[PDB]
Amino acid sequence: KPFTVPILTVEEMSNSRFPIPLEKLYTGPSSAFVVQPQNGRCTTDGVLLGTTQLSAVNICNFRGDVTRVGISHDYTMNLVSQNWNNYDPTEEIPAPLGTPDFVGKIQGLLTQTTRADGSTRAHKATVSTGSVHFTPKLGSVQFTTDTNNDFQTGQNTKFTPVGVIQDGHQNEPQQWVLPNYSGTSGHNVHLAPAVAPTFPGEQLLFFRSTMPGCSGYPNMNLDCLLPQEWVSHFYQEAAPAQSDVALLRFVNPDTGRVLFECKLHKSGYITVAHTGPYDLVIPPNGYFRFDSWVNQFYTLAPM
Amino acid sequence: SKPFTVPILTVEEMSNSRFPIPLEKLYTGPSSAFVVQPQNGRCTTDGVLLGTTQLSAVNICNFRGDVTRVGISHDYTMNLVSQNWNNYDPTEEIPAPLGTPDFVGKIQGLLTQTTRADGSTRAHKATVSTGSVHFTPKLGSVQFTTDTNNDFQTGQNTKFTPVGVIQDGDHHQNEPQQWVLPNYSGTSGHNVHLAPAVAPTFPGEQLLFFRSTMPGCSGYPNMNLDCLLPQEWVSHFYQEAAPAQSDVALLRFVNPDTGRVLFECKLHKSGYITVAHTGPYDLVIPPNGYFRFDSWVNQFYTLAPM
Ligand SMILES: CC(=O)N[C@H]1[C@@H](O[C@H]2[C@@H](O)[C@@H](CO)O[C@H](O)[C@@H]2O[C@@H]2O[C@@H](C)[C@@H](O)[C@@H](O)[C@@H]2O)O[C@H](CO)[C@H](O)[C@@H]1O
Numbered sequence: 001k002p003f004t005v006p007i008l009t010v011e012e013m014s015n016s017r018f019p020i021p022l023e024k025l026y027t028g029p030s031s032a033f034v035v036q037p038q039n040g041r042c043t044t045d046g047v048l049l050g051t052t053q054l055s056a057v058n059i060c061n062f063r064g065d066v067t068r069v070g071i072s073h074d075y076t077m078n079l080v081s082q083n084w085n086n087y088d089p090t091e092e093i094p095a096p097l098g099t100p101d102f103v104g105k106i107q108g109l110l111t112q113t114t115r116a117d118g119s120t121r122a123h124k125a126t127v128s129t130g131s132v133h134f135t136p137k138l139g140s141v142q143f144t145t146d147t148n149n150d151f152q153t154g155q156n157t158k159f160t161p162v163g164v165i166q167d168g169h170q171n172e173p174q175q176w177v178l179p180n181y182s183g184t185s186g187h188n189v190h191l192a193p194a195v196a197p198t199f200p201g202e203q204l205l206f207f208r209s210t211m212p213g214c215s216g217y218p219n220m221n222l223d224c225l226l227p228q229e230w231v232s233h234f235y236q237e238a239a240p241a242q243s244d245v246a247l248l249r250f251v252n253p254d255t256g257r258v259l260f261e262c263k264l265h266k267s268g269y270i271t272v273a274h275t276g277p278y279d280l281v282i283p284p285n286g287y288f289r290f291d292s293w294v295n296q297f298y299t300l301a302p303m
Numbered sequence: 304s305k306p307f308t309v310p311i312l313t314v315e316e317m318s319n320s321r322f323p324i325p326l327e328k329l330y331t332g333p334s335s336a337f338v339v340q341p342q343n344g345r346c347t348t349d350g351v352l353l354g355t356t357q358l359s360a361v362n363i364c365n366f367r368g369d370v371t372r373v374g375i376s377h378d379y380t381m382n383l384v385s386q387n388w389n390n391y392d393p394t395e396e397i398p399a400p401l402g403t404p405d406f407v408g409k410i411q412g413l414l415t416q417t418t419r420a421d422g423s424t425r426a427h428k429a430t431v432s433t434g435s436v437h438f439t440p441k442l443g444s445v446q447f448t449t450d451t452n453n454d455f456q457t458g459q460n461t462k463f464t465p466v467g468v469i470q471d472g473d474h475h476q477n478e479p480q481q482w483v484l485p486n487y488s489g490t491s492g493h494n495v496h497l498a499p500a501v502a503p504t505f506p507g508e509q510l511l512f513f514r515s516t517m518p519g520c521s522g523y524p525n526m527n528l529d530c531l532l533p534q535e536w537v538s539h540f541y542q543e544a545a546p547a548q549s550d551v552a553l554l555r556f557v558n559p560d561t562g563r564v565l566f567e568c569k570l571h572k573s574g575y576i577t578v579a580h581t582g583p584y585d586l587v588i589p590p591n592g593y594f595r596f597d598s599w600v601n602q603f604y605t606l607a608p609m
């Protein structure tokens with residue numbers, strides 16, 4: 001089966017690390033830090049990695065029953081799956097699929113239905129993924145909410161993420177620092193690998209969005225390695241990789257002209273030939289096109 | 304000549320095309336009491352987007368723009384911009400901005416804002432009542448009720464992220480009304496450029512719906528939300544653009560483990576599905592089941608009964 005990538009434009013696609021649209025493309029150095037996101041990780045032949053699942057609308061969502069912490073405004077959620085069934089902590093994944101893969105305070109609404117009478121409720125809520133109580137691999141997380149009494153026990157409860165907050169400027173979130181999925185009780189396991197360019201003159205290419213800010217002065221940049229639509233495409237197509245590197249051309253169909261070329265690595269990330277931080281300039285109808293299988297030492301034309 | 308296909312994703316791997324939530328189940332039921340005319344999740348099998356349909360579920364029922372307080376109240380008017388923060392164009396031949404809510408109801412979420420100059424940010428619980436006379440997205444503005452009367456700044460980029468729906472009143476589940484379109488221009492004019500209503504015409508047929516449950520945020524809302532196509536099918540058809548070789552694509556829903564067909568259905572080229580069934584029915588399916596395109600047929604194809 002011939003390999004392909006979607007023909008969708010950047011702004012027609014979704015971030016694979018938070019449920020927001022893609023905005024732009026960015027390249028920059030990343031030698032000084034670890035790039036190891038767990039969402040938006042998929043091989044070109046369709047093997048999902050890390051905590052990656054198939055739809056953007058499930059990312060950084062949580063479901064389960066909740067219990068109040070003491071008489072405070074905090075609630076513990078005993079996590080269940082997307083469809084309210086069991087999460088198995090023994091499955092060899094880092095945490096439930098869709099779990100946040102950055103240290104930060106994510107704000108949203110915690111909603112609940114009482115099954116007996118169909119009554120419903122919603123409260124502003126934040127999950128601090130750097131907290132010792134952020135233990136999704138153990139099956140629970142803790143939320144700070146705007147209520148100390150309105151949530152009932154034994155009722156289906158959902159967190160819908162909206163954005164991020166900060167306290168103290170732009171010092172958090174830390175998008176490239178993974179939370180400890182088991183808190184202080186254990187180290188992270190079964191992670192999608194860290195990624196880095198290996199060929200001189202190359203940098204990663206990032207698919208960038210801006211997370212909404214909900215309080216304070218947060219760092220709102222969020223970069224993913226693959227659009228969510230690419231994850232779903234590769235998962236479905238499962239086209240065999242004929243080498244370790246797929247050569248893509250980013251084309252302006254208005255003119256047929258190639259704007260730049262890049263390497264899509266089989267293990268699921270892109271590099272470009274560039275040195276330095278750069279906000280790419282792309283036309284609104286531009287898109288990526290797979291042209292040929294090449295190798296790790298093929299020299300890209302400068303971006 | 305390009306062969307037509309539908310995605311192989313399972314129902315629970317896909318997304319509702321009318322609200323940013325996962326699909327839960329397949330449902331068929333009677334539709335004679337309704338006009339079924341959703342504007343999101345509308346796309347032909349050869350990839351022509353219809354109504355207010357755009358390509359990603361994460362944008363549905365989102366709004367962006369600048370806000371101004373209404374009087375000295377807790378309500379704010381949002382002057383809409385496009386998804387990428389560029390000016391909105393009311394002259395485009397669509398019913399309303401792509402992604403606009405296509406039902407009458409009170410959608411609750413958070414209204415967030417950043418002050419560009421210093422990176423300061425804020426968020427407030429907010430509700431948009433799409434049945435309100437102030438719901439005028441085609442004209443370029445909608446109104447929100449919020450939990451503040453003072454915290455939002457003028458001239459700053461503001462986003463509404465939807466979460467769920469609310470209800471008020473002794474008549475439980477009286478709202479939202481998922482099959483009642485808003486007036487996109489309010490009282491100023493009638494709706495324009497709509498994707499057409501759909502209905503079964505062949506004896507013994509009903510629509511097949513891809514169903515989710517919207518989160519409830521207050522009161523006793525009707526949380527059912529049915530779409531005609533998963534968002535992933537919209538995206539698939541838009542990209543593939545495979546020519547329709549007849550009016551109807553016959554699909555079989557298959558259990559991949561046994562290879563057995565569970566049921567068959569008619570995917571009309573204009574982008575909706577019928578099945579041979581009468582009455583409300585939550586389909587009993589294996590979670591790994593998927594739809595498979597088998598052949599090009601016509602509107603009078605008599606299906607094996609569900
Ligand atoms: C949880 C809460 O009550 N939020 C309110 C509160 O917000 C303040 C407050 O949390 C302080 C204390 O840490 O920090 C900020 O000042 C925060 O305000 C928010 O962020 C600042 C930088 C501004 O951008 C502000 O507009 C924004 O609200 O009080 C404020 C009103 O002052 C809001 O009501 C929050 O929702």
Ligand SMILES: CC(=O)N[C@H]1[C@@H](O[C@H]2[C@@H](O)[C@@H](CO)O[C@H](O)[C@@H]2O[C@@H]2O[C@@H](C)[C@@H](O)[C@@H](O)[C@@H]2O)O[C@H](CO)[C@H](O)[C@@H]1O
Pocket residue numbers: 119120121122147150520521522523
């Ligand atoms: C803004 C606020 O203070 N909400 C409270 C309040 O919310 C109520 C209130 O808005 C009434 C208006 O008559 O409507 C509901 O009762 C609403 O509550 C919500 O819906 C009901 C049916 C319950 O499911 C409830 O738990 C939910 O909050 O009062 C409630 C307490 O009942 C909460 O304190 C809200 O925060």
